[PDB]
Design a protein around this ligand. Structure first.
Ligand code: MXK
Ligand SMILES: *[C@@H]1O[C@H](CO[C@@H]2O[C@@H](C)[C@@H](O)[C@@H](O)[C@@H]2O)[C@@H](O)[C@H](O)[C@H]1NC(C)=O
Ligand SMILES: *[C@@H]1O[C@H](CO[C@@H]2O[C@@H](C)[C@@H](O)[C@@H](O)[C@@H]2O)[C@@H](O)[C@H](O)[C@H]1NC(C)=O
Ligand code: NAG
Ligand code: NAG
Ligand code: NAG
Length: 526
């Protein structure tokens, strides 16, 4: 019940799940807290301790702005942090099966949130189900987000960038040294994450410093080649002094600017984060990954194209309606409380919100490819198109392109297309299979029959959990026991993927081919 780690001794707690027991270690620190002088830089090695650490409750979430656009609405507040915010937040969690396993495959989860939000404490990231059903060990960590974690003056150790990525990486190192004492196999470690977390997974594939810290990778609705995924160094530094003039920390010795930024309380840093870009976006990564030259040594699209990444198996996938979630965060004519039927001109106004610094002809190119309807007169035409426009551009096509380029270098890749709409999804029905609402199925939440999910969702979650675990343990996401569809490798020629839903899991080819060619061949030119 008490585990001796290579820097201290931690105590956990027992949980009863499905007539069994899971040992949970909540909130274990993996770094000296990045407070005071340590704010904005790479995490430092946590030094030894003497007590028995009582890791029996989620630790603090990292500082972050909160989605306040729907106060009291579970669809929005589900994602807001559910522990205290604090700069002292570099902690992790461990779920081990009871009784303690011997050489268990370890799953490391990295949450999403546009690199500005998110926390491991979330209800839909509970790894107790996974530990019980599949007797894998589940780990998740808190990493700094927003400017406190991704402010960048490139070169400057006082603020080099990618600190939150380096946070993640130090947690992977902690698993390498300590997960053996928990009965886990450091030689069988699968990273998985969602959206921004999924982009981080793909970045750990490029980053040499992480190659020795995991074996395989799963990417859910995200990859680094997504337009929101990596910030330039041009706009990065523009974004730091814009934050310095907003805080009155404009100096000219870049190190002395940082010292000024450290005696500002976290709330003032959070407040100015928004106004740092002139024309924001529902998907505006104001402070995100950069080519720091330390974690990310080159422009990631070049590393990808030229095969400069860890060779291993990936599992990639997207949801049917990735885009809809963002339409009600600014797009005109949209709301979560009506059918959101928009017209042609509400659509065109919606493009300017999602593509603000894009030419007039560029906006017209998007309109021409998505408003040549399979047929006119349907009232949802413009509503559905703009959802797809945001989905195809920001998630679906970059994930597909990432998978093709990765597979061309000879590794097994598996692609899925999640198209089940949760029967408990709070948002309306026109928003479809929303971005983020496969996570509960991955973590096995429909397995708790007390949780209001239908039987079919329990079956679908049960198979997904099996497929995910098999991929983690054996590199192949099959469900061999029940007479279920086999999941084929994604080859760059045939481009086979598997659909996931309650009815049928069918095998199809070349997902969103016409739409994705537009986004990946002729739109990057504008
Ligand atoms: C982790 C996750 N998985 C599925 C969904 N989510 C959360 C989420 C949030 N938003 C739009 C609002 C935006 N947050 C982002 O995370 C941007 N990403 O690009 C934001 C910025 C600052 C302050 C409050 C909110 N859309 N989904
Ligand atoms: C850490 O926890 C120790 C034991 O906690 C208590 O006993 C266990 C078996 C559970 O029943 C738990 O809910 C109880 O609170 C304490 O004796 C010790 O003081 C704690 N240390 C610190 C620093 O909080
Ligand atoms: C860089 O930032 C410049 C300043 O932006 C303006 O001032 C900041 C403090 C914010 O309030 C912002 O909303 C304002 O627009 C921009 O004028 C400039 O376009 C940015 N980009 C470049 C490449 O210089
Ligand atoms: C766990 O499996 C790895 C696989 O190579 C092996 O090298 C290691 O010795 C095993 N350890 C235990 C404790 O079973
Ligand atoms: C900036 O200030 C720091 C701290 O005073 C100093 O070490 C450094 O040399 C300065 N750089 C320049 C270019 O003046
Ligand atoms: C396989 O089907 C049985 C019923 O025949 C069910 O109880 C079990 O949970 C299923 N397993 C998986 C992994 O889907």
């Amino acid at each position: 019940i008490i585990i001796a780690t290579k820097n201290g001794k931690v105590r956990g707690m027992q949980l009863t799940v499905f007539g069994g027991t899971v040992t949970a270690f909540l909130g274990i620190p993996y770094a000296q807290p990045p407070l005071g002088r340590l704010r904005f830089k790479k995490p430092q090695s946590l030094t030894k301790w003497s007590d028995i650490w009582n890791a029996t409750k989620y630790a603090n979430s990292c500082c972050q702005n909160i989605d306040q656009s729907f106060p009291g609405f579970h669809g929005s507040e589900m994602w807001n942090p559910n522990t205290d915010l604090s700069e002292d937040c570099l902690y992790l969690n461990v779920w081990i099966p009871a009784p303690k396993p011997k050489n268990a495959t370890v799953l490391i989860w990295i949450y999403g949130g546009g690199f500005q939000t998110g926390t491991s404490s979330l209800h839909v990231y509970d790894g107790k189900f996974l530990a019980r059903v599949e007797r894998v060990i589940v780990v998740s960590m808190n990493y700094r987000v927003g400017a406190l974690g991704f402010l960048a003056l490139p070169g400057n150790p006082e603020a080099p960038g990618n600190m939150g990525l380096f946070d993640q990486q130090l947690a992977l190192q902690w698993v390498q040294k300590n997960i053996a004492a928990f009965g886990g196999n450091p030689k069988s470690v699968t990273l998985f994450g969602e959206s921004a977390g999924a982009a981080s997974v793909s970045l750990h594939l490029l980053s040499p410093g992480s190659h020795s810290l995991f074996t395989r990778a799963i990417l859910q609705s995200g990859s680094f080649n997504a337009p929101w995924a990596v910030t330039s160094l041009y706009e990065a530094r523009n974004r730091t002094l814009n934050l310095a003039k907003l805080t009155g920390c404009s100096r000219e010795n870049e190190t002395e600017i940082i010292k000024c930024l450290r005696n500002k309380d976290p709330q003032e840093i959070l407040l100015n984060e928004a106004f740092v870009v002139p024309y924001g976006t529902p998907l505006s990564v104001n402070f995100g990954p950069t080519v720091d030259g330390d974690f990310l040594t080159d422009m990631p699209d070049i590393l990808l194209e030229l095969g400069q990444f860890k060779k291993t198996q990936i599992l990639v996938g997207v949801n049917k309606d990735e885009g809809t979630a963002f339409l009600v965060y600014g797009a005109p004519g949209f709301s979560k409380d009506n059918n959101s039927i928009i017209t042609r001109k509400e659509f065109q106004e919606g493009l300017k919100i999602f593509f603000p610094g894009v030419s007039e002809f560029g906006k017209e190119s998007i309109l021409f490819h998505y408003t040549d309807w399979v047929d006119d007169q349907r009232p949802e035409n413009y509503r559905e198109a703009l959802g797809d426009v945001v989905g195809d551009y920001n998630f679906i096509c970059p994930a597909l392109e990432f998978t093709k380029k990765f597979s061309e270098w000879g590794n097994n890749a598996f692609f899925y297309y999640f198209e089940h709409r949760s029967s408990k999804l709070p948002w309306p029905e026109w928003m479809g299979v929303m971005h983020g609402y496969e996570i509960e199925f991955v973590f096995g939440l429909p397995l708790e029959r007390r949780d209001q999910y239908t039987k079919a969702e329990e079956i679908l979650s049960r198979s997904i959990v099996k497929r995910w675990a098999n991929f983690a343990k054996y590199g192949n996401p099959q469900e061999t026991q029940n007479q279920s569809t086999s999941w084929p490798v994604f080859k760059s020629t045939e481009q086979k993927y598997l659909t996931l839903n309650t009815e049928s899991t069918r095998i199809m080819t070349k997902l969103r081919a016409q739409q994705c060619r537009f986004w990946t061949s002729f739109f990057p030119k504008v």
